[model samples]
Target: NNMIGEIENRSTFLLAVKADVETQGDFVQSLATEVRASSFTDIEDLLAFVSWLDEELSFLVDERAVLKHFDWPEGKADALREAAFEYQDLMKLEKQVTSFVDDPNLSSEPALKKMYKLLEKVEQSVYALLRTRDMAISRYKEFGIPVDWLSDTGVVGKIKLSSVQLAKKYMKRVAYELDSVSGSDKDPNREFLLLQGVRFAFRVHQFAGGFDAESMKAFEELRSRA
Candidate 1:
């Protein structure tokens, strides 16, 4: 599915509709504009928009291939699907952060701490997104996808993402630590729990980015705020 196309179309329709929200007569004029600009009637336009959305959803299903094996935990597939509606909301954080980056009112230590706390929430949201990527990779491995398909590293002219590679390295080190048998780990499920915990960290770390003093402060502030 061409998600870009769908988003463009929906945003255009929404902007047009929102422009006339306070006046029904103005809405009539807005509908006229839609008629003049589009080949379809209002209902047809909405139907077409919905059809494109369905197509994009189908594409996501095929890309993730979650339906193929049904390994997703119960209720998770629906939760993920519903969460797609919030992408636009999540994208706003970037704009907000950029606009407020140098705000004069935010210079005081306490104010900076509050801003850091907000940034932590935003970064945690990113971490959640990265966790989906980790889950997708795990499921891909479970599906027996060939290593060649994943081997973007050695191919000439390949576009390997440096951040993603770093994530892989971190996850590998985490896996190593979890598998190491270095003493009396008394819990029966210690290994399994530790491995899962490491994987969880890997997911969060991907979007949290490389840690630094600023990030440490952010984490501390987040805890304080909470």
Candidate 2:
């Protein structure tokens, strides 16, 4: 019995090490290479770069695969997604909205409105991820975060799962933010709904983006039936 327990623990430890090697090994190596080639101002910069690369990796691999399989948009989806704007682009879009006016005096008004509508569309698409928060989080919280049990069982190997969960949770908060601010001008309802709708449309194009579609359809049918 003692030998069996010892062997099992050893196997678990080895599997964990192997899992870490598979998932985050390349990520860490890439970050090291980048940092070696370039100078970082602080640890925050290094951390930010890691996060950005991690996101890029997912976009390139997982997201790209899902989109290709599901047939997502082939072109620039929006101003932010247009050229890869960080948080700054969001503010710029909002400023464009604030500068719009209907008066005969403002030439930029029409352009601003057009741009604002475009931004609203993009916003809707991104916010649609919020609807899946319950599904994404529940898996981690209730079922426990999945790790490569066949490979590694170490804490480092599990970090990737944490990072992924964090990303999903962040997305959930984004959708909720739009949902919460839907009609305020302070926030705008049309803008919010448009953002949500586009987000849903984008997901319809992405394989990983699914919700209770048939259920929603049935609900609508029953509402109309009554």
* Top TM-score model: 1
Candidate 1 overall Cα lDDT vs. reference? 0.39
Write model 1 residue lDDT over 105-142, tens digit each, in one string: 43233443444455466656555554564454454344
* Least well predicted 10-residue stretch by lDDT in candidate 2: 143-152
Q: Tally clashes: model 2.
A: 12
Pairs of colliding residues, candidate 1: none
Candidate 2 lDDT by residue in tens digits, 1-226: 8999999988876665555445655554554354334323333343355456546545333433333333232331221132223223433433443443334343333433443464454445334423533453343233222222112232222322232222232233333444544354334544554454344333332422233444344234323322
lDDT of predicted model 2: 0.38
Q: Pick the candidate with the highest lDDT.
A: 1
TM-score of each: 0.27, 0.21
